[PDB]
């Protein structure tokens, strides 16, 4: 009786939200951006190839100086690369080799990683002893660690396969905030440029926008037909793009609270592993299972170019903070640095 | 055209690669086993005989180092992280023979043995395990023999039309799992009958892994 009545009210609320979104859908992003000229063909060459990982690479993250990056592989090694020279700055042996994510702190003093061990380990890069040591192991998730992002040297947000995201206090080792509401494994998260909000994509084919300070879900974005594997904020923080197993990328707007554009091609039938934006946001770079990375025109939904330089699944990619280069990591155990030429 | 500190940084990088190569060679001389199975299938008993989210067990047997990974605690979606184990030497799948007349506690309608077969079919025929051998353990041999005297195998498999004895019912169950092998050319299934007091399980794994090591050597050398 009471349960039946309540679940009927949820359907009414869902219809109310759907009608509200349809009311403000006066135009389409495609119609708005019809007049603008296309970006043309985007040609990027492999400037650097980072060799040394001996297993599949699952994650990489640029440092804020746009020169150092950290990559994680399931050979149990965290490696910090000097992308300009391809020199290895550090090689961090991981206690658990089943790492799925890695993050570089914006200060450059810390890196984080974690995988099937359900632990987010924080590593101190600046020690008087001259070696990288574990400073914290963040326990509390009951599923595998899928993504992590630093807010500062003391705060980090992690997403897990236990359907929850958590905000951690690194100094005390306790999760100050727990973000619940996903019904599937959360696979990725992206921080807003001001680090006051973050979006997460889960295996329930939905993307939720979370308030870091308040700790509740502000908006929920649906439209994908399969698990969301990747998510990335637009450079202004007012939009984000997702990548799913249905071979599509979608651009959602926070303020319009609905999907604006879909990035798919008929030839593409494989899942998407990673997504990122260029510095201006005009380019959306997505990594795919078909061993390639496709550069999309974000505004016009045109495939601007292809990065085809890997012999296995492109598992991760990232664009530098200055926008100078994009790195792609792959299951073939190599990282490559790409940029165009005049 | 390198400065005095740039040359030292390149020398430091070569020191890192000299250790990454050293660690990679040592990692290639070790055996990695993905331990799978269902609840109350004797999986924990196998670990006790071979002494967070994932549990890794190290043991050395006859100058060979084994790393056995247990993922029984990972209650999340398997398809999201099952690809992390693509490349393990072998998969140890444990099936409880006595769990043929029993039923699932939650489902209350699916046979316990039929539950294992579906899991075995989805793992053996998984796209990440096309050429990965499987070491099949059939635990609770003694308990199955006691139950087969009172409870016939016809309850679990209606099509069974053989003698209601251990020597035939157990062999019939073995053929049922081996029949689920959808690729009988790229991989082989090593079936063993363990027990609660058996001590040859580790020897069987060493022999089964040794054949898997030989097969991989033949492929790399070009003979296979």
């Amino acid at each position, epitope marked *: 009786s009471e349960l039946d009545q309540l679940r009927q009210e949820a359907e009414q609320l869902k219809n109310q939200i759907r009608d509200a979104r349809k009311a403000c859908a006066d135009a389409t992003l495609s119609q708005i951006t019809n007049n603008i000229d296309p970006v043309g063909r985007i040609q990027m060459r492999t400037r650097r190839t980072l060799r040394g990982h001996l297993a599949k690479i699952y994650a990489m993250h640029w440092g804020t100086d746009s020169r150092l990056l950290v990559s994680a592989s399931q050979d149990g090694k965290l490696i910090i690369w000097d992308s300009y020279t391809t020199n290895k*700055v550090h090689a961090i042996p991981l206690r658990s080799s089943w790492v799925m994510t890695c993050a570089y702190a914006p200060s*450059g003093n810390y890196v984080a990683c974690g995988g099937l061990d359900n632990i987010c380990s924080i590593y101190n890069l600046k020690t008087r002893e*001259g070696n990288v040591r574990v400073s914290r192991e963040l326990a509390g998730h009951t599923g595998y660690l899928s993504c992590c992002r630093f807010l500062d040297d003391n705060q980090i947000v992690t997403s897990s396969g236990d359907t929850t995201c958590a905000l951690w206090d690194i100094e005390t080792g306790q999760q100050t905030t727990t973000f619940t509401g996903h019904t599937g494994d959360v696979m990725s998260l992206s921080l807003a440029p001001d680090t006051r909000l973050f979006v997460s994509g889960a295996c329930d084919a939905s993307a939720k926008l979370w308030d870091v300070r308040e700790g509740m879900c502000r908006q929920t974005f649906t439209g994908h037909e399969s698990d969301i594997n990747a998510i990335c904020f637009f450079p202004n923080g007012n939009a984000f793009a997702t990548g799913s197993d249905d071979a599509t990328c979608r651009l959602f707007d926070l303020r319009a609270d609905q999907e604006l554009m879909t990035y798919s091609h008929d030839n593409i039938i494989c899942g998407i592993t990673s997504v990122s934006f260029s510095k201006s946001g005009r380019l959306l770079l997505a990594g795919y299972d078909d061993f390639n990375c496709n550069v999309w025109d974000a505004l016009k939904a045109d495939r601007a170019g292809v990065l085809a330089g890997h012999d296995n699944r492109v598992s991760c990619l990232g664009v530098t903070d200055d926008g100078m280069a994009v790195a792609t990591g792959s299951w073939d155990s190599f990282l490559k640095i790409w940029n165009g030429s005049s | 055209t390198l*400065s*005095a*500190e*740039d040359k030292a*940084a390149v*020398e430091r990088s070569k020191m890192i690669d000299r250790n990454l190569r050293e660690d990679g060679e040592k990692a290639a001389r070790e055996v990695k086993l993905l331990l799978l199975g269902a609840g109350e299938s004797g999986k924990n008993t196998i670990v006790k005989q071979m002494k967070t989210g994932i549990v890794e067990t190290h043991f050395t047997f006859k100058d060979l180092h084994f790393k056995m990974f247990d993922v029984g605690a990972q209650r999340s979606e398997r398809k999201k992280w099952i690809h992390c184990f693509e490349g393990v030497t072998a998969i140890i799948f444990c099936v409880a023979l006595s769990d043929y007349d029993l039923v699932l506690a939650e489902d209350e309608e699916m046979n316990r043995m039929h539950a294992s077969m579906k899991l075995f079919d989805s793992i053996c025929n998984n796209k990440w395990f096309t050429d990965t051998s499987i070491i099949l353990f059939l635990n609770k041999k003694d308990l199955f023999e006691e139950k087969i005297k009172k409870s016939p195998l016809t309850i679990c498999y209606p099509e069974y039309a053989g003698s209601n004895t251990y020597e035939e019912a157990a062999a019939y169950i073995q053929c049922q799992f081996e029949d689920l092998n959808k690729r009988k050319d790229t991989k082989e299934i090593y079936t063993h009958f363990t027990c609660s007091t058996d001590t040859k399980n580790v020897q069987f794994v060493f022999d089964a892994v040794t054949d898997v090591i030989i097969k991989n050597n033949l492929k790399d050398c070009g003979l296979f």
Partner: single-chain antibody
Amino acid sequence: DVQLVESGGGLVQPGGSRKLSCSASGFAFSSFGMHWVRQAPEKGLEWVAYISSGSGTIYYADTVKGRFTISRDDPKNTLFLQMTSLRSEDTAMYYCVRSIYYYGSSPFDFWGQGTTLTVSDIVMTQATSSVPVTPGESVSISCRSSKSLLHSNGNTYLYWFLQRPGQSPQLLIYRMSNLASGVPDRFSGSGSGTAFTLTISRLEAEDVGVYYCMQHLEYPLTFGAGTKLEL
């Protein structure tokens, strides 16, 4: 804590041989390159030898090459300096210096206490030998180099050291602008090309000492004469 203790020094006859040891504790010894730097009595710092991490690269000063041998024992965390044919010119305090080299590292960050031995090229110029100073007042120290220390990679390999009276040198500024860990922010390094300035805002009693500028553009590493601050 990070420690570098030197031993084996003492009075030796000319033409003799002596073995210097540097025991390291509190840091990853095998990860650091090691230098020997000596200081003649009432004189400035002089670089002696260098052995890299992994012992693959070894450099010597021309004045000691062929007579001194530098070696390390990574398992024992000991740095060695085998000296032969010792001359009266070798009478100095020998310092053990650790230095690690990667992008953004701070070489020459820690120095040993030193051991005293008594026997019976880019030019770095610090023309101002002494500067009278008062606490709370801003002081600038100038250094010059015969060659441009700015490399094509954008780094300017100039280092600043402070040797307080009775103490070992301490790193203040590495690569001409970066502030070393544990150094107050009042110290600032500014330079261009061959001319460099070390600015000390709000001078204090601890800042009293001798300041040395060193170049790390190429070997042999050379030191300036040194600028002494006195009250």
